[PDB]
Amino acid sequence: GITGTWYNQLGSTFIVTAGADGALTGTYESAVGNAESRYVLTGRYDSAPATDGSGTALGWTVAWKNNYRNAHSATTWSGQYVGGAEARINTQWLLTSGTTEANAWKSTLVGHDTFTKVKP
Amino acid sequence: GITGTWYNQLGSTFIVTAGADGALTGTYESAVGNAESRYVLTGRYDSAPATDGSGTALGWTVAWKNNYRNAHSATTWSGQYVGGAEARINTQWLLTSGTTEANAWKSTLVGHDTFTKVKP
Amino acid sequence: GITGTWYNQLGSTFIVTAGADGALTGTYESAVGNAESRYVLTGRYDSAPATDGSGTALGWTVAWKNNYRNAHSATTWSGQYVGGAEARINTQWLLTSGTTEANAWKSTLVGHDTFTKVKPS
Amino acid sequence: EAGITGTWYNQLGSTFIVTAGADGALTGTYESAVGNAESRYVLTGRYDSAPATDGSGTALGWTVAWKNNYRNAHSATTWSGQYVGGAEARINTQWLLTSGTTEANAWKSTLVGHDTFTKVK
């Protein structure tokens, strides 16, 4: 139920393929009408989840460099896919920027994102 | 400088290859070195970091399923590589386990790992 | 304003008073976990926030010991109060349990709670 | 003896002086290595005053809002962690620093990190 297009609550979209070997591969678009706002993602998911009501654990990374832009940073999302008629991917994320050592204390933001199969 | 064998502070073993386009691939886990303890990882890194002394942002995921065990969970590490005399990767991580909706509040552990090219 | 009774998305009850000196005091009752009736909280908030439409930063702690139960753990909530037609406190939290050194890597849970003055029960 | 009352130093110079009350309160101040009044802020928190006896640490947490009589950063840090006793006593923490932001900037409101405190520097 993971392969396809997902939308967060803030205007981002990604398309992912959940491969038979546990791979997640796809593209994350940070801004809707922008073609220079697309980035590679890559991650892993549990390809044999429990069928007991529990979500399917997964995670992925986007390094915020493409052919057009580079923020010198990367986000990782860690979360779980929850199926059903209102399917969701519920995540928490860490965004680390490259810094000098003196700035390392402020290198990492934390937050949370919920993705749905239908636009907000 | 990222490609290589790294060890965290607890002795976990991170064997990674960084490709020219931003891909990370490799295997994660073990001090025991047994086959039941090794897992696929994939991730991303900034392939054109700043030239001002800042580190190189990266992240990767392991889903904790292999041919031997399945913990129904996934860890993502978000961090930066710091070159120089003693290379290091400093990270923070999120470990999400699949849960029911009622237990989702306790699904995610957080911590920090530092990796070097020598065993602890 | 921050002073009042708030509820998170799970129905936990946060009764707080914001003092003129930046202090938060009050009680917390959890909808989840190894917890029963009210626990003491204390924290701090920015008593002179920016005037540009930003929220008001704050944080508080509950140690999960009262006269009835002790879970040997503590949650801290870090967040901001956002004035609006529907005022909200948006937080991230860290729950640390006391552990042995061997188990310290799994000592800390992380999550996010949103509080409103209206209960979403 | 809880072992927590006193002065602690993190790995980056900062100092705090805390009192651990018999009732689970933490009260004190957080300051820089320099120690000037302008670098000193109130803190408040809670700790488990009856920790387990199996070798586990003592859970605790505290908050500093970064406003004092001199300066205001419109932000607050919470530290969540555990005290570990012995000759080399430590407090191992993870922290969340939330800044007041507009809603448009709320996605970047919160930094995360970790701090280890010891009794010597």
Q: Give the pairing type, strands B56-65 and B70-82.
A: antiparallel
Chain C positions touching B78 (Cβ under 8 A) are none
Decide if C74 contacts C62 (C-beta within 8 A).
yes
Q: What is the DSSP letter of B93?
A: E
Q: Is A108 touching C (CB cutoff 8 A)? A: no
Decide if A45 contacts A57 (C-beta within 8 A).
yes
Neighbours of chain A (3+ CB pairs under 8 A): B, C, D
Chain C positions touching A92 (Cβ under 8 A) are 110-112
Question: What element of type H or E holds C13?
Answer: strand C13-18
d(C-alpha A56, C-alpha B36), whole Å:
21
Q: Which CATH topology does B4-116 take?
A: Lipocalin (2.40.128)
Q: Do C110 and A110 touch (CB under 8 A)?
A: yes
Structure tokens at C9: 């998305």
Long-range contacts of C100-104 (CB under 8 A, 24+ apart): C100/D54, C100/D55, C100/D56, C100/D57, C101/D84, C104/D57, C104/D82, C104/D92
Q: Do C60 and D78 touch (CB under 8 A)?
A: yes
Find, among D47, D120, D31, the residue nearest to D81 by Cα: D47
Phi, psi of C68 (to 5 degrees): -110, -40
d(C-alpha B107, C-alpha D48), whole Å:
23
Q: Is A109 touching D (CB cutoff 8 A)? A: yes
Find, among B110, B27, B18, the residue nearest to A76 by Cα: B110
- B12-31 exposure pattern, b = at least 16 Cβ within 10 A, e = fewer: bbbebebeeebbbbbbbbee
Q: What angle do CA B88, B94, B99 make, to 5 degrees?
A: 160
Structure tokens at D108: 């970047």
For chain A, the structural domain boundaries read 4-115
Structure tokens at C68: 């009835």
Q: What angle do CA D116, D73, B93 make, to 5 degrees?
A: 40
Q: Do B109 and C109 touch (CB under 8 A)?
A: yes
d(C-alpha A36, C-alpha A27), whole Å:
12
3-state SS string for chain C:
CCCEEEEECCCCEEEEEECCCCEEEEEEECCCCCCCCCEEEEEEECCCCCCCCCCEEEEEEEEEECCCCEEEEEEEEEEEEECCCCCEEEEEEEEEECCCCCCHHHCEEEEEEEEECCCCC
Residue whose pair of structure tokens reads 């580190």 in the numeric block: B55
Residue type, D1: E
Decide if B22 contacts A65 (C-beta within 8 A).
yes
User: Mutate which of C21, C42, C56 to disrupt the D interface (most D C-beta within 10 Å)?
Assistant: C42
Report the residue from B94, B105, B110 with minimal CB separation from C94.
B110
For A102, residues 6+ apart whose C-beta sits below 8 A from its C-beta are: none
Phi, psi of B104 (to 5 degrees): -65, -30
Residues 1-20 of B with CB under 8 A from A: none
Q: Does domain A4-115 have CATH number 3.50.50.60?
A: no
d(C-alpha A79, C-alpha B75), whole Å:
9
Cα dist from A81 to A6, B100, C114, D65, whole Å: 11, 11, 21, 36
Q: Which CATH number fits domain D8-118: 2.40.128.30, 2.60.40.10, 2.70.70.10, 3.30.830.10?
A: 2.40.128.30
Decide if D113 contacts D95 (C-beta within 8 A).
yes
Structure determined by: X-ray
d(C-alpha A59, C-alpha C84), whole Å:
34
Neighbours of chain C (3+ CB pairs under 8 A): A, B, D
Structure tokens at A32: 């809707």
d(C-alpha B57, C-alpha B61), whole Å:
14
Q: What is the DSSP letter of A28?
A: E
For D96, residues 6+ apart whose C-beta sits below 8 A from its C-beta are: A110, C59, C76, C78, C92, C93, C94, D77, D78, D80, D110, D111, D112
Strands, E assignment, D1-121: 6-10, 15-20, 25-31, 41-47, 58-67, 72-84, 90-99, 110-118
Distance from CA of A13 to the nearest CA of D (A): 16
Distance from CA of C106 to the nearest CA of B (A): 7
Q: Do A110 and C111 touch (CB under 8 A)?
A: no
Within 10 angstroms of residue A83's Cβ, the number of other Cβ atoms is 12
Decide if C7 contacts C121 (C-beta within 8 A).
yes
Beta bridge partners of B79: B58, B91
Decide if D75 contacts D66 (C-beta within 8 A).
yes
Structure tokens at B120: 């602890």
Structure tokens at B40: 């696929």
Q: What angle do CA C11, C17, C18 make, to 5 degrees?
A: 120
For D1, residues 6+ apart whose C-beta sits below 8 A from its C-beta are: none
For D52, residues 6+ apart whose C-beta sits below 8 A from its C-beta are: C72, C98
DSSP string, C55-66: -EEEEEEEEEE-
d(C-alpha A14, C-alpha A2), whole Å:
11
Residue C45 labelled as part of a binding site: no
Structure tokens at B23: 């891909």
Residue C60 labelled as part of a binding site: no
Residue C68 labelled as part of a binding site: no
d(C-alpha A69, C-alpha C48), whole Å:
38
d(C-alpha B61, C-alpha A45), whole Å:
9
d(C-alpha A21, C-alpha B40), whole Å:
10
d(C-alpha A57, C-alpha B70), whole Å:
11
Cα R_g (chain B), whole angstroms = 15
Strands, E assignment, B2-107: 4-7, 13-18, 23-28, 39-45, 56-65, 70-82, 88-97
Cα dist from D12 to A8, D73, D118, whole Å: 37, 19, 11
Decide if A115 contacts A88 (C-beta within 8 A).
yes
Within 10 angstroms of residue C67's Cβ, the number of other Cβ atoms is 9
CA D76, distance to chain mean position in Å, is 11
Decide if D46 contacts D34 (C-beta within 8 A).
no
Q: What angle do CA C73, C79, C82 make, to 5 degrees?
A: 145
Structure tokens at D22: 């018999």
Q: What angle do CA B112, B114, B119 make, to 5 degrees?
A: 135
Q: What is the DSSP letter of B101?
A: G
Dihedral (C-alpha) D65, D67, D72, D75: value to the nearest 10 degrees?
A: 0
| Burial tier of C118 (Cβ tally within 10 Å: 0-12, 13-18, 19+) | exposed
Residues 40-99 of A with CB under 8 A from B: 40-50, 52-65, 70, 72-80, 82, 90-99
d(C-alpha D113, C-alpha B112), whole Å:
8
d(C-alpha B58, C-alpha A96), whole Å:
8
Is the four-CA dihedral A51, A52, A53, A57 of positive or negative sign? negative
